[PDB]
Amino acid sequence: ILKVARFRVLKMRPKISTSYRPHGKWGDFLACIIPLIWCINILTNSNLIL
């Protein structure tokens, strides 16, 4: 947030985005660890109470 608000505006330091298309292949899998941990914690607590 700080970086975007301080430097990414046209006035300060715009960047020439030359990338045409995305190429991510497993970033979704890497990111889903955190929601995976959330689901694991929810399941554990719920089952322990049940």
Partner 1 sequence: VQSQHSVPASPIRNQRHINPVRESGPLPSYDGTYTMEDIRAVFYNTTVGRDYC
Partner 2 sequence: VAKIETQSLAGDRFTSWVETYQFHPLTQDQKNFDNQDNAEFLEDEGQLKYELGVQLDNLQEMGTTSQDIVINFMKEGTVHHPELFEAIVKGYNIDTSDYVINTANNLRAREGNHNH
Ligand X SMILES: CCCCCCCCCCCCCCCCCC(=O)OC[C@H](COP(=O)([O-])OCC[N+](C)(C)C)OC(=O)CCCCCCCCCCCCCCCCC
Quick one: which of 24, 2, 6 has its CA closest to 14?
Answer: 6
* Binder of residue 15, out of partner 1, partner 2, ligand X, none (CB less than 5 to 8 A by kind): partner 1
11 binds ligand X (CB under 6 A): no
Min separation Cβ 34 and ligand X, Å? 9
Report the C-alpha gap between 24 and 32 in whole angstroms.
14
Residue 49 within binding range of partner 1, rule CB under 8 A: no
* Residue 18 C-beta: closest distance to ligand X, Å: 24
